[PDB]
């Protein structure tokens, strides 16, 4: 009598109120006495009282079923990833026993019901991925036991409310990805003593970071990224005893990185990139055993402290786009599983550290636009983890290690604008994933290896401004995925063959300023996607092939060769006046 | 950068069955290491080479963001929809090659603002309407093919069009003028 219920009847009313195209609610049989064994329904006690309803990803369409609030013992409701639509009803407060409410990834629209704060048992509120608009209700400051407030990815257009700082029980404040009216971070957020997460990414935040945030000793994640925050990073953030992640990237922050960040024992991830930060990266910060340090696109200067190499957890260092001087730490990568290194667009000098890939996890080596000198470390020949190598615009010298040519997962190898010498090793055949090979403006010598043709996936070969010599390997013509071949300013000799027909995807052929001899092959016309052809500064001989007329070329240079005969009819226009100059018998 | 963001916008709207745009990673600082993209020494795009890539879908106005673009090659694809008017904001363009596609609608009057254009190949499309008179004011134009389209109206015979032959304007719906067989009302 006292503890009898009509919970099954109430759930049938919910089923009737919602569209169920995929028949997720088929198990909900009106005939069954109890709803406790129905799909998504849990009764955690005696009395067969429904305590939990989970209908996640059920493709249910319709407004919130306010009848469900007649389930007296409902403590957990999830309608996550459904098509629940219309306004959230004010009579949701009738669900007075709800501890967890997840209405995330639905079509809910309109203003937030203030009656959500009138549910005293509510601990977890997730409304992420909805169309909610308007100001956050003042009632939200009066939540009695709320630990999680998530309003992420909505259309909330009000200011960030200071009253949200009045929820003493709050552990997670998640207001990210909302078109909020530009507003400062309320200093009253410092009063949230139990807060573990402050996620305010892309919330149109303005003004300075309040020093009060330093009082949040339980904070684990501070994310104020993608805002317009101005001023210095507060030295008070040294007070964040339990912080693991600090994200301040893409703001208008100025001033020096506080050394007090060294006091954060649990800090593992810091990203203050895309700011206007000035001064040196502090030694105390680098002494912390960080997993990820990103300080790229700032105005930072001075040397990178050698302490950073001490961390056994470092996989990510992106400090590109600064004025950092001196050498990289000697022991970098020796004690850490370094995966991503980007020190590009800096004033770094000296040899590359010898043990960057010691733990065998280095995927990206990006050091472009620096004054790095010396030889590639021989260890990197065994770094098979590497996928992207950019050593361009440095003062590097010496031969490339044999293994480095043959690394299996490297997609881009760029050694451009160095003084690298020696030959491309036959090991190049082992570069199974190599798409872009750029060796331009070096001192490379010798013949292109025959194994370069074994690279079926090669898309770009650019080796201009080198001392490469010899006949082109026959295998080079076998490359059917090659779109760019630039070998200009070399000592290449010999004749092109009929094999040029296999360059079906070639857009640019530049063989200019070489010592090429022989007739231009008739198969040049078979190249349907060729739009740029430079064979200038060679000793090419004989009649220009008639097939060249058929090609739709945006650039043609056959100048300074030994070509003979009458110019093909179509190529004899005023537009091609500078294309065939310096051919006496033409 | 802005240029990479614009090219990524094109990638999202284009349909790429053979993943020719796989290398087009928006997280890169610039698109210069992207395959099918060529940049200048100042790292600004001067060439987009996507001819015969089996591309479908439509172009975007954001292509106009590429101020230093000199060669746009989208030929031998199944691209549909209008030629964006914002392509007229490509001041340094030398080649516009949209031929062998399913492009429809008008040839934009904005294309007249391309002062350095030498190559305009819009042939083998479903383009309609009249050939813009603005194109005559392009002194640099030396190659023009508007053939195998559904264009109509008077064919301009002045400025750059003075030297153009009938092969440029062939197989159109209702073109009139001295280059054409039929003279104009």
């Amino acid at each position: 009598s006292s503890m009898d219920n009509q919970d099954g009847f109430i759930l049938q009313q919910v089923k009737l109120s919602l569209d169920d195209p995929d028949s997720y609610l088929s198990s909900w049989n009106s005939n069954d006495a109890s709803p406790c064994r129905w799909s998504g329904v849990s009764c955690a006690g005696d009395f067969s009282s429904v305590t939990s309803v989970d209908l996640s990803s059920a493709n249910l369409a319709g407004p919130f079923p306010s009848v469900i609030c007649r389930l007296s013992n409902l403590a957990h409701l999830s309608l996550y990833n459904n098509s629940i639509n219309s306004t959230l009803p004010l009579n949701i407060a009738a669900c007075k026993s709800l501890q967890t409410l997840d209405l995330s990834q639905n079509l809910l629209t309109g203003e937030l019901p203030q009656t959500l704060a009138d549910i005293p048992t509510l601990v977890h509120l997730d409304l992420t991925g909805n169309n909610f608009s308007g100001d956050i209700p003042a009632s939200f400051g009066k939540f009695e036991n709320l630990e999680v407030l998530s309003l992420v990815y909505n259309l909330l257009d009000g200011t960030i409310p200071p009253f949200l700082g009045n929820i003493s029980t709050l552990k997670m404040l998640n207001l990210s990805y909302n078109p909020f009216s530009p507003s400062r971070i309320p200093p009253e957020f410092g009063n949230l003593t139990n807060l573990e997460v402050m996620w305010l990414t892309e919330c149109h935040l303005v003004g300075q970071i309040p020093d009060s945030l330093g009082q949040l000793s339980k904070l684990v994640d501070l994310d104020l990224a993608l805002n317009d925050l101005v001023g210095h990073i507060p030295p008070s953030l040294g007070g964040l005893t339990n912080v693991v992640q600090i994200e301040l990237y893409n703001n208008s922050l100025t001033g020096e990185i506080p050394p007090e960040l060294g006091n954060l024992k649990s800090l593992r991830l810091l990203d203050a990139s895309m700011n206007q930060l000035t001064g040196k990266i502090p030694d105390e910060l680098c002494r912390v055993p960080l997993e990820s340090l990103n300080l790229y696109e700032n105005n930072l200067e001075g040397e990178l402290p050698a302490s950073i190499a001490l961390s056994p957890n470092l996989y990510e260092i992106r400090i590109f786009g600064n004025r950092l001087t001196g050498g990289l730490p000697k022991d970098l990568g020796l004690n850490s599983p370094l995966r991503w290194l980007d020190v590009s667009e800096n004033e770094f000098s000296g040899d590359l550290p010898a043990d960057l890939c010691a733990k065998g996890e280095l995927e990206e080596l990006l050091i472009i636009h620096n004054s790095f000198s010396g030889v590639i470390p021989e260890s990197l020949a065994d770094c098979r983890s590497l996928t992207r190598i950019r050593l361009a615009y440095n003062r590097f010298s010496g031969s490339v290690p044999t293994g480095f040519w043959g690394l299996p997962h490297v997609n881009l190898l760029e050694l451009v604008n160095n003084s690298f010498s020696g030959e491309i090793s036959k090991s190049i055949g082992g570069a199974s994933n190599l798409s872009l090979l750029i060796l331009s403006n070096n001192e490379f010598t010798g013949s292109l290896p025959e194994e370069i043709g074994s690279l079926d996936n090669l898309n770009q070969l650019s080796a201009s401004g080198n001392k490469f010599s010899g006949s082109l390997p026959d295998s080079l013509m076998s490359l059917g995925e090659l779109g760019t071949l630039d070998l200009h300013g070399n000592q290449f000799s010999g004749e092109l063959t009929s094999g040029i027909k296999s360059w079906k995807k070639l857009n640019e052929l530049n063989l200019a300023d070489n010592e090429f001899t022989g007739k231009i092959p008739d198969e040049i016309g078979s190249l349907s996607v060729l739009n740029y052809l430079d064979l200038s500064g060679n000793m090419f001989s004989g009649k220009i092939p008639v097939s060249l007329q058929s090609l739709k070329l945006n650039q043609l240079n056959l100048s300074y060769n030994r070509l003979s005969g009458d110019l093909p009819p179509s190529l004899a226009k005023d537009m091609y006046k500078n294309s065939f100059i310096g051919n006496p018998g033409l | 950068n802005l240029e990479g963001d614009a090219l990524h916008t094109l990638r999202v709207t284009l349909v790429d069955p053979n993943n020719v745009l796989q290398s087009w990673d928006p997280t890169l600082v610039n698109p210069c290491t992207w395959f099918h993209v060529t940049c200048n020494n100042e790292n600004s795009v001067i060439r987009v080479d996507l001819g015969n890539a089996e591309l479908s879908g439509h172009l975007v106005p954001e292509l106009g963001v590429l101020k230093n673009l000199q060669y746009l090659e989208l030929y031998s694809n199944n691209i549909t929809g209008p030629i964006p008017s914002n392509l007229g904001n490509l001041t340094n363009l030398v080649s516009l090659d949209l031929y062998l596609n399913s492009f429809s609608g008008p040839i934009p009057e904005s294309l007249g603002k391309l002062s350095k254009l030498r190559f305009l190949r819009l042939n083998n499309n479903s383009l309609t309407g009249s050939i813009p008179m603005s194109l005559t004011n392009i002194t640099t134009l030396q190659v023009l093919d508007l053939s195998n389209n559904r264009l109509s109206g008077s064919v301009p015979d002045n400025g750059s069009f003075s030297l153009f032959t009938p092969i440029s304007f062939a197989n159109n719906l209702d073109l009139c003028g001295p280059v054409t067989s039929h003279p104009c009302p």
């Binding site: 990815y153 990805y177 994640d221 990224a225 992640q245 991503w340 | -």
Partner: peptide, 14 residues
């Protein structure tokens, strides 16, 4: 379904 970018480091690189 809206894909929400997780709280974590920025991913821009050369």
């Amino acid at each position: 379904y809206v894909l929400v970018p997780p709280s974590g480091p920025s991913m821009r690189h050369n």
